[PDB]
Design a protein around this ligand. Structure first.
Ligand SMILES: CCCCCCCCCCCCCCCCCC(=O)OC[C@H](CO[C@@H]1O[C@H](CO[C@H]2O[C@H](CO)[C@H](O)[C@H](O)[C@H]2O)[C@H](O)[C@H](O)[C@H]1O)OC(=O)CCCCCCCCCCCCCCCCC
Ligand SMILES: CCCCCCCCCCCCCCCCCC(=O)OC[C@H](CO[C@@H]1O[C@H](CO[C@H]2O[C@H](CO)[C@H](O)[C@H](O)[C@H]2O)[C@H](O)[C@H](O)[C@H]1O)OC(=O)CCCCCCCCCCCCCCCCC
Ligand code: CLA
Ligand code: CLA
Ligand code: CLA
Ligand code: CLA
Ligand SMILES: CCCCCCCCCCCCCCCCCC(=O)OC[C@H](CO[C@@H]1O[C@H](CO)[C@H](O)[C@H](O)[C@H]1O)OC(=O)CCCCCCCCCCCCCCCCC
Ligand SMILES: CCCCCCCCCCCCCCCC(=O)OC[C@H](CO[C@@H]1O[C@H](CS(=O)(=O)O)[C@@H](O)[C@H](O)[C@H]1O)OC(=O)CCCCCCCCCCCCCCC
Ligand SMILES: CC1=C(/C=C/C(C)=C/C=C/C(C)=C/C=C/C=C(C)/C=C/C=C(C)/C=C/C2=C(C)CCCC2(C)C)C(C)(C)CCC1
Ligand SMILES: CC1=C(/C=C/C(C)=C/C=C/C(C)=C/C=C/C=C(C)/C=C/C=C(C)/C=C/C2=C(C)CCCC2(C)C)C(C)(C)CCC1
Ligand SMILES: CC1=C(\C=C/C(C)=C/C=C/C(C)=C/C=C/C=C(C)/C=C/C=C(C)/C=C/C2=C(C)CCCC2(C)C)C(C)(C)CCC1
Ligand code: OEX
Ligand SMILES: [Cl-]
Ligand SMILES: [Cl-]
Ligand SMILES: [Fe+2]
Lengths: 35, 56, 348, 35, 25, 30, 449, 76, 336
């Protein structure tokens, strides 16, 4: 019965920013990771 | 010679045509679509009097 | 005061005079900003005008020498001073002002008072936002110019062999530090600068678009052709159609902002994330942890004499920058290159 | 190659004549603002 | 309507039509 | 092999662009 | 004068106050046309005063004197300047005419009537009157048409113009046979703009230039008479905006292309812009270098045909991608360069190396060596080499100033097109002041657009 | 009080700033034209860059003994 | 019905109810920028190597020829072609087109003709939505800078091989070679362009933070503050007086913009004018005007050269130009 219970929300525009961010970083950095 | 070219790289041809069918492409496609615009000109307004544009 | 009513000490008599709504706000931070920022600007304008760089660098950098605005600078100390702070009471200068200027100690005068000036300016805008009772986002954005300044002017030379390889405070002097990082660090290729470009050059896009989207979706709130007159900052309604602005870009670019608060935070976010990433790359270059080489394309281009990319062209251009400037860029090395040992293409 | 050139000149002049006769087909009246 | 200097006569109200509620411009 | 990984990261980025336009969360007015 | 609240225009857009003020707008243009003639008088006499005869015309930073030299006033064979007094008369006749244009420009701006509609009905105009606008358009085409016949009369009858392609070297040549063939004249216009064509920047002789101005002179006299006696047809009512800012934006997009054309005209062409007066072109100086070291090394005992470069293509002579024997090096890109010093060495099958091993003339290597040290690269403070060059000479080519100024002016006037054509189309539609806030047209559209 | 436009238009501003402002410009003119700027800041005059000992650029090359070395590099 | 075939096509092209607006500029833009997009992706992945320099050494730029995302590029056209027009049908084989840099000139011709029409339909939808027009004037500044690198600088230098390569590391080569030949850093129009993107990044963070720091309390601390704005609400979600009255105490009171409409004009005009200059600066150096050359400017008595920082830039400049295009030059002056 913790009164400090919260929920996380993530709308689809934040999904589209998040998925883009980890693919663009994978487009960027993996050229260096595969070297 | 060795291969086959079109040989028009620096020849300065009018609209870049060298087979006469290319000029009829230019007139056919312009003429087909001038005619579609001309027949469809009855839906664009009859701007017949003198003060009949988008003016200010 | 404090809802318990103590008697005011001399602090409260000093706090209300500093936090006074006069013409220029001093505040408590102004005891740190205004002495330091006046001496960074005063040190830069004196050093570019009068102070030589003939001993630290072997090259003239003042207006009194013959330089103009582009080529004059307050140049870094020699590589023989290592990371010496070059206090005028220091072991190198030893009280003499006219030799402290010749030893390049006026560089570290500007760099240290500029560094504590940036602390004084960032504390200024915490202090004003607590007076005005706003949110502190103007200061948090200024963490990124402090992230750039500390990582380039302070953190980078501390990892190198001295304050020599710091940027000198000038126009053409920044430009060689820029050309130093291409030739030596291959700093365009570093993916932290790539995130730094996309932040800086993407905030310039957001500045130009949000400025033009607002200015072209304005409501007709006036009669005349000057649309700047049809505004009062105490109005409760938006001055431009956000709904028209959304439908415009959702059909031009396909994706538009629908939230005005997310837009202006995204304008906040892009230049700050861009500069913090680029500051990490200069931290990496302080240790010479470069993103210099793709080793899989160096092994191939050395085992195949016809494999040329624009990458291997860039590696050859950096060899040109390194050998042709370092007889004059690094005079402490005292390296003489005979003209037949420097790299050279055909007929140039 | 000439078959490709005839095709591109049919294609490009199709879209250029859409452009030209589109603005001749009463573009300035396609405003929402009435006078 | 007072017919401003590029044609395009003004649609009724003057400059900053919220002066009645806000008082300035 | 890595070129297969490169194109998958480029196709995957162009996939998110396609979904962010044609399957965006639509802005509800009022 | 006039203020803001009586117009709705601030001080920074106050020439827009005199849109519907016909007389004030007339004095605005006549005083501005005074400035164009005043600059052309003042900068001419500035260039006459600073002309030094023991230096080339292109070395001295002269951009207006090569235009009067191209007409053939005061030039000799080979581009030698005979006298400078014909350049002085052109400077004074503009500097005196600028006071006359300056007077009536100041007159109609201050004393003359604000709108000349009710008192002077011939000069009066409303912007929406499509007859009167074509009437004024027809008057000025006849002025442009008769102005184009001044170049034809000066080339055919009044002493001739400078032909840099003349037999015996370049001098002033009366153009007795201008080319009036429509297949040749209208063949430049439909030519591609790319390499080997250069749209109308490759016009290679003065007979096409003068014969082309016969065509542009007659068509503008005929097209002026056409617009005086006609009104725009109903399809033209349907396509255009009929405001004064629209007519400006139509002129701004037309003149911004013309700035781009004269940018590439002065950079590439060396017939209407002779190299004796304007200096070598970009292609001319790069081809002059390969010609200079080809003559330098034939005399030092080397077969320049059989000489293989470090890449294997040929150090001095290589083959064009269409099969012409051209100069080797990075100047393979400028192989379609033609020059009056180079074309005597060129046969059908490209350059003729039999003609080029035996019949290099001493005047050709004089001139090509001049063009190599006057390449159109410089600096902004007029240094005169590559960016890696010390302060030795004082040179930026006029072609480098004429192209760079007129790309920038051509770029901004395309921006001025996009400004005013967007505004005049929107101001005629009614929403140039903003969204109406009562009927916002997005609010009457279906969402999920 | 005094909002930056009743100062610049006041004549008492210009009965001060037409005397102190030119005498401060001349004070800057004479700080350099009397050669004192070359002495205070230690910038070398155009006849002081190269002594007879060296004909090259100076090099400080010593940390704790730089104070008397730059006296020897300058030629004093 | 009464409406013809062409009239129902015009009401569909100019329809504001399409998801992506087309317009009459979009009947040019869409088949242009789908042509250049399709041939970019195929040539970035699978194009065979390209003789960029015209000296019959090919340069690889494709993922299938041993490149990654950074070093891959669509290589510019051959130097032997120059400014000549080289479509597919002017080649003998398709592989000769691929060898001579043919894909580059097809991308660049369709990309430039597509961004001129992207700018055209940003005007057009503004006119269809009842907007004021000049978002297109703001987009003319990246259009001019794209036009400078792919069209105008090749026109001035006389070859599309001097155009910008279509890739990441190919761009970097284009910048480094540019600074050796033209000294772009010492050019004032590039200096103004840097002031436009450093100012435009300052002002994006400045205007972006003052609005964020003036948000009216609408939500709790358990939900983002971006929830406090509703799309389509007519009230104004932040305090402009508190934002203006904060930047007023930060430096000066009359150094701020109390007018939010005047604020957003300056917010648009600082990057756009700055990029307008660096697009022209690149286009003036296209004609070899070049950057300031202060080399051997400071000279002491007895006529001897004192170096400056510009002389050190020259040592970095002439290191690149003795190494760029290292086999092209048979002659000592890089006039091309
Ligand atoms: C190497 C070569 C390369 C090619 C050549 C390249 C260069 C070509 C440049 C040529 C010049 C082009 C200029 C064209 C201007 C068109 C302007 C226009 O919008 O023009 C608009 C006007 C409109 O005219 C008016 O249009 C009106 C429309 O009426 C309609 O609507 C009315 C109400 O509005 C009434 O209801 C009426 O009953 C109804 O009919 C009226 O009919 C008027 O009578 C009529 O005068 O058109 C007109 O004046 C006539 C327009 C000019 C003639 C067009 C000919 C097109 C080509 C024909 C050949 C085709 C060949 C096909 C080959 C097939 C095999 C392959
Ligand atoms: C199709 C539409 C194409 C649009 C323009 C592409 C230009 C391509 C080009 O290579 O154009 C160059 C041509 C010049 O072409 C050159 O023309 C030359 C002609 O000189 C020849 O002929 C001369 C005759 O004296 C000389 O003798 C000389 O020796 C000889 O070489 C050569 O043929 C060259 O090979 C050839 O490249 O310019 C021209 O034709 C004039 C055309 C206008 C050029 C506009 C450039 C700027 C574009 C706008 C950019 C800003 C937009 C801003 C948006 C925001
Ligand atoms: C080529 C430049 C040019 C020209 C020809 C004009 C012309 C004009 N402007 Mg514009 N203007 C310009 C640039 C120009 N302007 C610029 C750059 C700005 C922005 C600062 C403006 C801002 C502006 C505003 C805000 C307004 C005008 C107005 C006017 C008109 C009335 C002038 C008047 O009453 O002044 C009276 C001023 C004077 C008499 C001062 C003396 C100036 C004289 C003319 C100088 C002549 C010197 C010359 C050497 C004389 C030679 C004489 C000859 C015999 C040799 C006039 C037609 C007004 C308008 O629209 O009218 C309805 C108006 O309200 N202008
Ligand atoms: C547009 C056509 C044009 C062209 C091609 C030239 C070309 C030339 N001129 Mg001429 N000139 C022109 C217009 C032109 N000028 C005009 C309009 C004037 C009247 C002012 C003159 C007056 C003039 C004189 C008096 C002299 C020349 C000289 C020269 C030569 C060298 C110029 C130089 O070093 O510039 C250096 C480069 C610049 C000054 C850059 C100009 C950039 C401008 C200032 C825009 C800057 C942007 C800025 C942000 C906008 C400002 C406004 C903003 C603050 C609000 C060169 C042949 C000289 C010469 O050779 O004489 C024989 C010479 O003595 N010109
Ligand atoms: C300053 C010059 C000028 C101006 C502004 C006008 C303005 C006008 N003219 Mg006039 N005209 C002029 C000179 C001028 N004219 C001259 C010199 C002639 C004699 C040749 C004519 C003969 C003339 C006739 C016979 C007619 C006009 C008409 C018109 C009107 C509409 C024109 C239009 O929409 O074209 C739009 C142009 C097109 C749709 C053609 C397509 C253009 C594309 C780009 C292809 C062009 C190919 C061509 C061969 C050029 C190739 C090179 C090019 C790429 C640079 C407008 C009022 C019409 C009108 O209403 O008048 C009563 C009309 O019927 N004009
Ligand atoms: C012959 C061309 C022409 C003509 C007649 C007009 C006429 C007009 N314009 Mg347009 N305009 C033009 C070209 C033209 N413009 C171009 C090329 C541009 C793009 C730059 C614009 C951009 C423009 C804007 C943005 C606006 C106008 C406006 C106006 C109106 C009032 C302008 C005024 O009072 O200026 C006042 C003059 C000034 C305030 C001084 C400006 C000086 C600038 C800083 C340049 C300084 C010169 C400098 C040496 C050039 C450096 C660049 C160089 C490197 C090339 C009037 C209808 C205004 C209007 O009411 O719209 C209808 C308006 O808001 N114009
Ligand atoms: C912003 C403005 C930018 C500045 C513009 C300055 C003017 C540039 C345009 C004028 C010069 C070109 C005149 C026409 C040349 C021509 O016919 O090209 C003809 C060329 C010739 O094409 C080539 O010619 C060669 C022979 O020389 C060979 O035959 C080749 O096989 C052939 O492909 O075709 C093109 O280059 C492409 C033209 C098609 C693209 C046009 C886009 C139009 C967009 C809508 C316009 C609506 C109006
Ligand atoms: C092939 C392209 C290139 C490959 C790219 C690979 C990487 C892709 C990364 C992005 C993945 C998707 C991110 C999240 C999308 C989202 O949440 O949409 C939300 C919308 C919800 O809208 C609502 O959906 C409702 C249906 S329902 O509620 O979902 O049942 C519907 O009724 C309503 O109209 C609608 O508004 O989803 C849909 O409309 C349909 C369901 C989408 C299912 C996910 C697809 C996963 C990708 C598979 C593609 C093939 C991969 C293998 C081959 C390469
Ligand atoms: C309206 C106005 C304006 C404008 C104005 C103008 C633009 C004017 C113009 C004017 C002009 C345009 C003028 C001119 C003049 C000229 C003159 C006055 C001349 C004279 C001449 C002479 C004097 C000569 C001499 C000589 C000789 C004979 C030879 C030798 C040399 C000499 C030089 C000596 C302004 C903007 C201000 C503003 C608003 C108002
Ligand atoms: C002198 C000379 C010459 C000649 C020339 C000529 C003869 C010219 C002419 C020219 C021409 C003859 C030109 C024309 C032009 C035209 C144009 C450029 C057009 C434009 C168009 C437009 C602009 C349109 C638009 C639109 C559309 C699209 C549709 C309709 C409507 C609108 C408006 C929308 C030569 C070269 C031989 C040589 C040198 C010198
Ligand atoms: C360092 C030092 C010191 C001393 C002193 C000082 C701190 C001083 C300051 C000083 C200063 C604080 C100075 C200032 C200066 C300024 C200037 C030098 C400015 C100039 C300006 C100009 C040159 C401008 C021009 C122009 C322009 C560009 C814009 C507007 C217009 C005109 C044209 C006018 C001390 C003891 C602390 C300690 C040791 C170190
Ligand atoms: O193309 Mn790309 O970079 Ca105008 O310089 Mn010569 O060419 Mn080439 O080398 Mn250096
Ligand atoms: Cl070469
Ligand atoms: Cl290279
Ligand atoms: Fe905003």
């Amino acid at each position: 019965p913790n009164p400090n219970k919260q929920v996380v929300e993530l709308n689809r525009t934040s999904l589209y920013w998040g998925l883009l961010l980890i693919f663009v970083l994978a487009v960027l950095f993996s050229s260096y990771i595969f070297n | 010679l060795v291969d086959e070219r079109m040989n028009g790289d620096g020849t300065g041809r009018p609209f870049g045509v060298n087979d006469p069918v290319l000029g009829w492409v230019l007139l056919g496609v312009f003429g087909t679509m001038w005619a579609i615009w001309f027949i469809g000109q009855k839906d664009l307004g009859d701007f017949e009097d003198a003060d009949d544009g988008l003016k200010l | 005061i404090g809802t318990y009513q103590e008697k005011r000490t001399w602090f409260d008599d000093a706090d209300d005079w500093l936090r006074q709504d006069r013409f220029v706000f001093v505040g408590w931070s102004g005891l740190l900003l205004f002495p330091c920022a006046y001496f960074a600007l005063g040190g830069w304008l004196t050093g570019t005008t009068f102070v030589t760089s003939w001993y630290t660098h072997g090259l003239a950098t003042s207006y009194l020498e013959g330089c103009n605005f582009l080529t004059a600078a307050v140049s870094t100390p020699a590589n023989s001073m290592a990371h010496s702070l070059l206090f005028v009471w220091g072991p190198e200068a030893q009280g003499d002002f006219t030799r402290w200027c010749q030893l390049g100690g006026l560089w570290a005068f500007v760099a240290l008072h500029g560094a504590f000036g940036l602390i004084g300016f960032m504390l200024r805008q915490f202090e004003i936002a607590r007076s005005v009772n706003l949110r502190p986002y103007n200061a948090i954005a200024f963490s990124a110019p402090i992230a750039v300044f500390v990582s380039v002017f302070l953190i980078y030379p501390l990892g190198q062999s001295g304050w020599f390889f710091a940027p000198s405070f000038g126009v053409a002097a920044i430009f060689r530090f820029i050309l130093f990082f291409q030739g030596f660090h291959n700093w365009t290729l570093n993916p932290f600068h790539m995130m730094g470009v996309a932040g800086v050059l993407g905030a310039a896009l957001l500045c130009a678009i949000h400025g033009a989207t607002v200015e072209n979706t304005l409501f007709e709130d006036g009669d005349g052709a000057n649309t700047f007159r049809a505004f009062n900052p105490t109005q409760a309604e938006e001055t431009y159609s956000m709904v028209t602005a959304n439908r415009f870009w959702s059909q031009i670019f396909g994706v538009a902002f629908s939230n005005k608060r997310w837009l202006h935070f995204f304008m906040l976010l892009v230049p700050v994330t861009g500069l913090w990433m680029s500051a990490i790359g200069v931290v990496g270059l302080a240790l010479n942890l470069r993103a210099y080489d793709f080793v899989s394309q160096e092994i191939r281009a050395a085992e195949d004499p016809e494999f040329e990319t624009f990458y291997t062209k860039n590696i050859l251009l950096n060899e040109g920058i390194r050998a042709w400037m370092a007889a004059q860029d690094q005079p402490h090395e005292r390296l003489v290159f005979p003209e037949e040992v420097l790299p050279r293409g055909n007929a140039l | 190659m000439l078959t490709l050139k005839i095709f591109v000149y049919t294609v490009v002049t199709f879209f250029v004549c859409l452009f030209i006769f589109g603005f001749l087909s009463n573009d300035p009246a396609r405003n929402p603002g009435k006078n | 309507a007072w017919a401003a200097a590029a044609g395009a006569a003004g649609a009724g109200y003057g400059v900053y039509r919220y002066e009645a509620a806000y008082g300035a411009a | 092999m890595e070129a297969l990984v490169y194109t998958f990261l480029l196709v995957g980025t162009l996939g998110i662009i396609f979904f962010s336009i044609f399957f965006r969360d639509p802005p509800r007015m009022i | 004068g006039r203020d803001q609240e009586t117009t709705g225009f601030a001080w920074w857009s106050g020439n827009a106050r005199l849109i519907n003020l016909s007389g004030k707008l007339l004095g605005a243009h006549v005083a501005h046309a005074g400035l164009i003639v005043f600059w052309a008088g003042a900068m001419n006499l500035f260039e006459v005063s600073h002309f030094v005869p023991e230096k080339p015309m292109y070395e001295q930073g002269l951009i207006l004197l090569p235009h009067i030299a191209t007409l053939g006033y005061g030039v000799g064979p080979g581009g030698e300047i005979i006298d400078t007094f014909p350049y002085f008369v052109s400077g004074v006749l503009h500097l005196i005419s600028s006071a006359v244009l300056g007077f009536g420009g100041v007159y109609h701006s201050l004393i003359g009537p604000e709108t000349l509609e009710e008192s002077y009905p011939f000069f009066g105009y409303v912007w929406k009157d499509k007859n009167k606008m074509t009437n004024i358009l027809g008057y000025h085409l006849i002025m442009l048409g008769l102005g184009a016949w001044l170049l034809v009369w000066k080339a055919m009858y009044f002493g001739g113009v400078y032909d840099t392609w003349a037999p015996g070297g370049g001098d002033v040549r009366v153009i007795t046979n201008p080319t009036t063939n429509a297949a040749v004249i209208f063949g430049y216009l439909v030519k591609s703009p790319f390499g080997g064509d250069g749209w109308i920047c490759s016009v290679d002789n003065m007979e096409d230039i003068i014969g082309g101005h016969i065509w542009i002179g007659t068509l503008e006299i005929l097209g002026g008479i056409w617009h005086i006696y006609t009104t725009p047809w109903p399809w033209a009512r349907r396509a255009f905006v009929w405001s004064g800012e629209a007519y400006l934006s139509y002129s701004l997009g037309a003149i911004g292309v013309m700035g781009f054309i004269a940018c590439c005209m002065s950079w590439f062409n060396n017939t209407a812009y002779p190299s004796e007066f304007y200096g070598p072109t970009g292609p001319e100086a790069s081809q002059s270098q390969a010609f200079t070291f080809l003559v330098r090394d034939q005399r030092l005992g080397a077969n320049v045909a059989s000489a293989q470069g470090p890449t294997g293509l040929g150090k001095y002579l290589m083959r064009s991608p269409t099969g012409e024997i051209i100069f080797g090096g990075e100047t393979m890109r400028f192989w379609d360069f033609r020059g009056p010093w180079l074309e005597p060495l060129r046969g059908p099958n490209g350059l003729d190396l039999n003609k080029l091993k035996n019949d290099i003339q001493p005047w050709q290597e004089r001139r090509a060596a001049e063009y190599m040290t006057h390449a159109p690269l410089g600096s902004l403070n007029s240094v005169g080499g590559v960016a890696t060059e010390i302060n030795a000479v004082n040179f930026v080519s006029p072609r480098s100033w004429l192209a760079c100024s007129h790309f920038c002016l051509g770029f901004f006037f395309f921006i001025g097109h996009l400004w005013h054509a967007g505004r005049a189309r929107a101001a005629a539609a009614g929403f140039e002041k903003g969204i109406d806030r009562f009927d916002e047209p997005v609010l009457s559209m279906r969402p999920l657009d | 009080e005094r909002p930056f436009s009743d100062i610049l238009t006041s004549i008492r501003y210009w009965v001060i700033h037409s005397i102190t402002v030119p005498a401060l410009f001349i004070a800057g003119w004479l700080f350099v034209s009397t050669g004192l700027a070359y002495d205070v800041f230690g910038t070398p005059r155009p006849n002081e860059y190269f002594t007879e000992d060296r004909q090259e650029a100076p090099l400080i090359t010593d940390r704790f003994n730089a104070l008397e070395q730059v006296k020897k590099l300058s030629g004093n | 019905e009464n409406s013809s075939l062409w009239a129902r096509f015009c009401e569909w092209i100019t329809s504001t109810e399409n998801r992506l607006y087309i317009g009459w500029f979009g009947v040019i833009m869409i088949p242009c920028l789908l042509t250049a997009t399709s041939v970019f992706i195929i040539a970035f992945i699978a194009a065979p190597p390209v003789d960029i320099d015209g000296i019959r050494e090919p340069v690889s730029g494709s993922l299938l020829y041993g490149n990654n995302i950074i070093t891959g590029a669509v290589i510019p056209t051959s130097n032997a072609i120059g400014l000549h027009f080289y479509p597919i049908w002017e080649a003998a084989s398709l592989d000769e087109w691929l060898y001579n840099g043919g894909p580059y000139q097809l991308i660049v011709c369709h990309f430039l003709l597509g961004v001129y029409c992207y700018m055209g339909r940003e005007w057009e939808l503004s006119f269809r939505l009842g907007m004021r027009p000049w978002i297109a004037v703001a987009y003319s500044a990246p259009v001019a800078a794209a036009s400078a690198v792919f069209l105008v600088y090749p026109i001035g230098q006389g070859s599309f091989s001097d155009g910008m390569p279509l890739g990441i590391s190919g761009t970097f080569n284009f910048m480094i070679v540019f600074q050796a030949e033209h000294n772009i850093l010492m050019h004032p129009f590039h200096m103004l362009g840097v002031a436009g993107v450093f100012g435009g990044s300052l002002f994006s963070a400045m205007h972006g933070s003052l609005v964020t720091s003036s948000l009216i309390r609408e939500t709790t601390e358990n939900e983002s503050a971006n929830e406090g704005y509703r799309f389509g609400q007519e009230e104004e979600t932040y305090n402009i007086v508190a934002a203006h009255g904060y930047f007023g105490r930060l430096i000066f009171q009359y150094a701020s913009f109390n007018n939010s409409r005047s604020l957003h004009f300056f917010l648009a005009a600082w990057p756009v004018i700055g990029i307008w200059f660096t697009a022209l600066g690149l286009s003036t150096m296209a004609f070899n005007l070049n950057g300031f050359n202060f080399n051997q400017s400071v000279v002491d008595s007895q006529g001897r050269v004192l170096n400056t920082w510009a002389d050190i830039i020259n040592r970095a400049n002439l290191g690149m130009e003795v190494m760029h295009e290292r086999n092209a030059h048979n002659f000592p002056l890089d006039l091309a």
